[PDB]
Design a binder for this molecule. Structure first.
Ligand SMILES: C[C@H](O)CC(=O)SCCNC(=O)CCNC(=O)[C@H](O)C(C)(C)COP(=O)(O)OP(=O)(O)OC[C@H]1O[C@@H](n2cnc3c(N)ncnc32)[C@H](O)[C@@H]1OP(=O)(O)O
Lengths: 291, 293
């Protein structure tokens, strides 16, 4: 089989860094790629901090081993500002860069010429169709979606997205990898939203619309889903959490794709917040104000 | 103000039973009403079992304390086959019977003649407008929705629905009553699905479709929502928990009001199961087969 051992993660964002961190943490040799050394420096530092916060809790009875474990994981993460040189022999390429098709297709089209033969390609994209990216290459059978959730290092779920062209061996390789990461892989076809976002996002929009109709308050709607349906967070608390701009972008993506479906109709209230840079917790204000 | 102390719950079903239980466990005098004495005995048996379950848990170390807890509560739940025979002296009526408009109105039109003036009428209906049922009486200022969630003994939420005619006084009272039950009440307009069902049911339908569409399996969709969304139950386990028939009916109703709306399009899988009398856990089988209890 194609046992993934060496992994190339392109993108130093929280997602990219999280994926690198878990892979590093489970015995994989990792190479994190990005545009500048400064970015890489920060991202890796981010991983270092995250890794220590956990070690100070698990290795409280023996801090020596803790620092060891942390050092061993950091050193298994390498950095580079040139993907082409790195992917010449990597087993897997996981992409987690800006959510723009053009940009993504250039990268992979390029990497598809330097990457080894067996190299599997996979995107972590939330607002695009895997198939649209895989066709920017000729490695389609080795192209798939590998969708994670934030905080990557904590969230055990990973959606192994298989396209009609994706190989069966490719699928099984990503399923075994996901487990090797200590994750729980679920399967899904290259359909907009896959499983989680497909069922979670529209619901959130629905909650926003119910509020705009004047039928209930955001507070009561939140109390309602927590106490009535046993949810961790009400839809509004959750929106601020996952990011209002992040949500808007994804919905607009489906909206533009299917202008008729009423489920993807824009929300004036959502749009307003986004326009006036009120993205949620990551700006101290979304539907609610923070800190 | 008039504080609710005496409550008349109509419907020995799982919902009514639960409402009676929580009401009685929180110091309210309760009368549970259903068609026969055997039905009532069966319903009250389920309540007792649910109570000894809560007791041998809160008093896992003191059986005697657990017995008294159960006894006191259980002795404040009286049973009658004709609500008209008790409402003349009750403060609140909570109806949770067949989701049939004619049967509900018939019930309230009659009780509206035996009930004391202050008595408030409330329906736990999930698929009807509270306004529809209210206009079957001359007590609309004292009529409202009081919607609970399964499992009633556990879910803290209670939706207090106010129709354009519900007086503020009637509202505040149901609000205080909700808190007295140890629940947290939230307000909502009298719109289909109110708050929770309006956001939960459609979501549940979407999951069935993603499945029917062949995109993902039931098993993985449940795993995904539990791990990725943190829900206590995947959409299929929940469906099987609230009842497939129970769900279908509420959706058929919404579809019936807006056939053009996609959100309510019927589901072949759901319909087929209901036609096979596989309603979920109730019957030991819904989307999944459950080992008979
Ligand atoms: C259709 C309508 O109109 C309205 C509706 O009902 S919409 C649907 C609303 N309901 C929901 O959304 C269901 C979501 N699920 C839930 O919130 C939870 O899964 C749950 C409350 C059923 C409990 O889940 P779970 O963690 O698995 O608990 P469970 O294994 O069943 O039992 C353990 C706990 O639950 C309690 N419990 C569950 N059902 C109980 C019952 N019927 N009676 C007494 N206790 C019960 C136990 O006392 C216990 O407490 P413990 O942890 O301290 O020991």
């Amino acid at each position: 089989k194609i046992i993934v051992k060496h992994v190339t993660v392109i993108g130093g964002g929280l997602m990219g860094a999280g994926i690198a961190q878990v892979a590093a943490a489970t015995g994989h040799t990792v190479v994190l790629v990005d545009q500048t050394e400064d970015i890489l420096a920060k991202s890796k530092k981010g991983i270092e901090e995250s890794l220590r916060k956990v070690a100070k809790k698990k290795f409280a009875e023996n801090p020596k081993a803790g620092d060891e474990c942390v050092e061993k994981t950091l050193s298994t993460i390498a950095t580079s500002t040139d993907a082409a040189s790195v992917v010449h022999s990597t087993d897997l390429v996981v992409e987690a860069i800006v959510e723009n098709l053009k940009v993504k297709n250039e990268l992979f089209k390029r990497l598809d010429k330097f990457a080894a033969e067996h190299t599997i390609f996979a995107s972590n994209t939330s607002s695009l169709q895997i198939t649209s990216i895989a066709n920017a290459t000729t490695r389609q059978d080795r192209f798939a979606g590998l969708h994670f959730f934030n905080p990557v290092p904590v969230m055990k779920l990973v959606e192994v997205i298989k396209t009609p062209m994706t190989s069966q061996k490719t699928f099984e390789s990503l399923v075994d990898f996901s487990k090797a990461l200590g994750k729980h892989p679920v399967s899904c076809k290259d359909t907009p939203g896959f499983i989680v976002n497909r069922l979670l996002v529209p619901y959130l929009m629905e909650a926003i619309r119910l509020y705009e109709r004047g039928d209930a308050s955001k507070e009561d709607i939140d109390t309602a889903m927590k106490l009535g349906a046993g949810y961790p967070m009400g839809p509004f608390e959750l929106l601020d959490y996952v990011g209002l701009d992040t949500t808007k972008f994804i919905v607009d993506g489906w909206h533009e794709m299917d202008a008729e479906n009423p489920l993807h109709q824009p929300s004036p209230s959502l749009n307003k917040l986004v326009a006036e840079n009120k993205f949620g917790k990551k700006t101290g204000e979304g539907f609610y104000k923070y800190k």
